[PDB]
Amino acid sequence: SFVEMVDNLRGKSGQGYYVEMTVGSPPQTLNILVDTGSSNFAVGAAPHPFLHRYYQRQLSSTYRDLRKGVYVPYTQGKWEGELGTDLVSIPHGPNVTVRANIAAITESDKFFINGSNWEGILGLAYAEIARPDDSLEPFFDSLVKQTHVPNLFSLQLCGAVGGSMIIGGIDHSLYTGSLWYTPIRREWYYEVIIVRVEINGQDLKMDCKEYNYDKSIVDSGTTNLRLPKKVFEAAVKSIKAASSTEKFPDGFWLGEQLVCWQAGTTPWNIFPVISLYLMGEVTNQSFRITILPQQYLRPVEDVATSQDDCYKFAISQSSTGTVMGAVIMEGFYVVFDRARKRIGFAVSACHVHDEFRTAAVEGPFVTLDMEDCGYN
């Protein structure tokens, strides 16, 4: 019955992907952003310039107040509100209704985005990082405890129609080839371990611990592929060298300045492919996912005469570890197998195409001492 969930997501990498949900009785419809980087379920419950609609506790007869305040700060953006519970359903998801914790957002700062179309956020990470503390059971945890929905979900994010969030399973019609699994190192963020990095087949030759300093996570709520300072610099130096025959504006490599080319003349060939090797399921075994430039060059509308193809560098620097964002997830079908503490990757049915190259998930590879790649 997963067909009912296929294509249940809308949005793009730049402003996030959202799924339709209902809260309260009678059911109040709201678009909720899918965020594997947090664990709080929260919805705007007060007027805001960027909100076209919001949760009205006053209109719900099943709403219950927890008499507790709460706030959640994010890498970028933050909000505060009042905790409480209510009945939640997912129209284009499993046919069930559960009473889950809900944070009613009363104030926010740089959280809501202009024209994103979503009015709330669905934190799918573990309770360990939920605010105020891990006693506030996350939505997914509530779903699995109150129903027979299997403890796992998968995400097929499609860039530029929309995507799919299969709750409770894996839909084989959404991917090609084999699924490759990497262990979820620890149950807080969806933390993984990168054991090797290559650009155009060239090893970055860095201590693999640098790749996971201070950690590496899979986050649908982040647009870019964010890398620790050391790694980011080496990657840019390598990417620049690969496309040195091209001239780019100032601030382009900072994910700031936009770059354009004549309609259909984007020189993809000058941009290298990036291979991220992830810890595997068996001893001394890893597998790699390959990213095409079509993934790390996020298409953006031309500020003026919208005619040419413009893009923004979708690889940026981080100070809180590696973040495998949407631009990376878009090329694949990602399975968040909570039940077996692992994350699977497979080429997505909606992968972006290239003439002489193709994104891929390949294995097995032998990699010794992978455990030393983890940061402590």
């Binding site: 990498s13 899918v34 965020d35 980087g37 959640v72 970028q76 990082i129 986050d219 649908s220």
Partner: peptide, 4 residues
């Protein structure tokens, strides 16, 4: 976007 950069979502805890």
């Amino acid at each position: 976007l950069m979502x805890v």
